[PDB]
């Protein structure tokens, strides 16, 4: 067996950024040059590693996160970024080792009328820690008096929709993102080349 990268990159649905999906890759072999020799990605930055050397290396586990964001927003899927995505939805650590792979998904995730399936956290009291996943849907308490599940002044619903049609600008269109993380522990490495 080799690694099911096709069931993460080519999967039918993708997750919202705030509820990003994660897949744990183990006991398989992975050809990575088949990913960088696809020519089908708009973004493919690797950190702490070089994509070509990648098929030469071993890791104990590899993690594939995947989610949809907006065009101008792929800038935030980097170490050391700020903004509502990197602060409040998905944060990479300053010493990330792995690859951020993005591509244009305007063809599939942006329908006429609105694709309101894709959401993002717009309100949060404090920045995420790296690889944190906030799923609460509490009303957001911007004031000092609690909300008690009612929207209103100082009392905001925390997730907001993207609204993606197939007719847009450039960095206001939907992009599917896959973040690969490479972990090497004092344990039997199970993903090799």
């Amino acid at each position, epitope marked *: 067996n080799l690694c099911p990268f096709g069931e993460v990159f080519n999967a039918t649905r993708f997750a919202s950024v705030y509820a990003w999906n994660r897949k744990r890759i183990s006991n398989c072999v992975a050809d990575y040059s088949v990913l960088y020799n696809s020519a089908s990605f708009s973004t493919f930055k690797c950190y702490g590693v070089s994509p070509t050397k990648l098929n030469d290396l071993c890791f104990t586990n590899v993690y594939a996160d995947s989610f949809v964001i907006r065009g*101008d927003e792929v800038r935030q899927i980097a170490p050391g970024q*700020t*903004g*509502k995505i990197a*602060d*409040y939805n998905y944060k990479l650590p300053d010493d990330f080792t792995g690859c951020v792979i993005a591509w244009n998904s305007n063809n599939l995730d942006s329908k006429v009328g*609105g694709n309101y399936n894709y959401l993002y956290r*717009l*309100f*949060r*009291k*404090s*920045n995420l820690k790296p690889f944190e996943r906030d799923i609460s849907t509490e009303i*957001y*308490q*911007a*004031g*000092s008096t609690p909300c008690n599940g009612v929207e209103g*002044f*100082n009392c*905001y619903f925390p997730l*907001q929709s993207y*609204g993606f*049609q197939p*007719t*847009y*600008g450039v960095g*206001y269109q939907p992009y599917r993102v896959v973040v690969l993380s490479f972990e090497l522990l004092h344990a039997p490495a199970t993903v090799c080349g």
Partner: antibody
Framework: EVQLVESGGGLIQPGGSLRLSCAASGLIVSSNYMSWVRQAPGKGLEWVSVLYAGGSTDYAGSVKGRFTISRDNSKNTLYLQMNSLRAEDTAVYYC???????????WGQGTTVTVSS | DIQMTQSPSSLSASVGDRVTITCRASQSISSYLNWYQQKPGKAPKLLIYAASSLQSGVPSRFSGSGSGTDFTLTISSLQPEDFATYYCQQSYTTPLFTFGPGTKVDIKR
């Protein structure tokens, strides 16, 4: 009520510094997108800098590097440090709560900054 | 970047008129669009949020409509206190908001 009280404007020579203060009552600065917005004489509203609830900052291209937004949670007060002022920083300066899709609903009172030699 | 525009720069109206301000975003912004009132020497006042929701404490003669590139603010029966300048603001790219250039409503004569 909910109110954003501003202070600290005045006359200042070009190259000088000025510290604007916005004292919040009825919302928690630490919990909000807090923006500074300014309006030159006879022009419109221009966004300056923002303080995310999480602590991130962003700034207008034209003040990037000279101004720094900040806060003190103890005093529930928003700040703007204005250094290396030029003549075109002259405007009425507003602090405001940006509630995003729900609108910029709370606005300060204005404080006027004249930079002149 | 999204640039905002405003239909007529200034328009004249009589008390009791039905007034329509338009606003246009340089790119589809769905319905992330807010309307503001400003009288000389004072701070802006939020009138409409999310294109058509009425802000608390704002008279119901005010109303918004639109989605995409085009938006409209209506005042059903202009009151004497409504003579002022009206701005639109987009919040698609929050918190980096851009404002419209304004529409002044003065007194017809």
């Amino acid at each position: 009520e909910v109110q954003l009280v501003e202070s600290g404007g005045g006359l200042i020579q070009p190259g000088g510094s000025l510290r604007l203060s916005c004292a919040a009552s009825g919302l928690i600065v630490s919990s909000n997108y807090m923006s500074w917005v300014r309006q030159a004489p006879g022009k419109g509203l221009e966004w300056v800098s923002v303080l995310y609830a999480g602590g991130s900052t962003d700034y207008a291209g034209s003040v990037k590097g000279r101004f720094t937004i900040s806060r003190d949670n103890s005093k529930n007060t928003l700040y703007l440090q204005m250094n290396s002022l030029r003549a075109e920083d002259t405007a009425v300066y507003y602090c405001a709560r940006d509630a995003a899709v729900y609108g910029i609903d709370v606005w300060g009172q204005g404080t006027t900054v004249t930079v002149s030699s | 970047d999204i640039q905002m525009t405003q239909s007529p720069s200034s328009l004249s109206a009589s008390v009791g008129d039905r007034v329509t301000i338009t606003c246009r975003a340089s790119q589809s912004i769905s319905s992330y669009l807010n309307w503001y009132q400003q009288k000389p020497g004072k701070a802006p006042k939020l009138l409409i949020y999310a294109a058509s929701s009425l802000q608390s404490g704002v008279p119901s003669r005010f109303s918004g409509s639109g989605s995409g590139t085009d938006f409209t603010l209506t005042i059903s029966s202009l009151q004497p206190e409504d003579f002022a300048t009206y701005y639109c603001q987009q919040s698609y790219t929050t918190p980096l908001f851009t404002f419209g250039p304004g529409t002044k409503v003065d007194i017809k004569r």
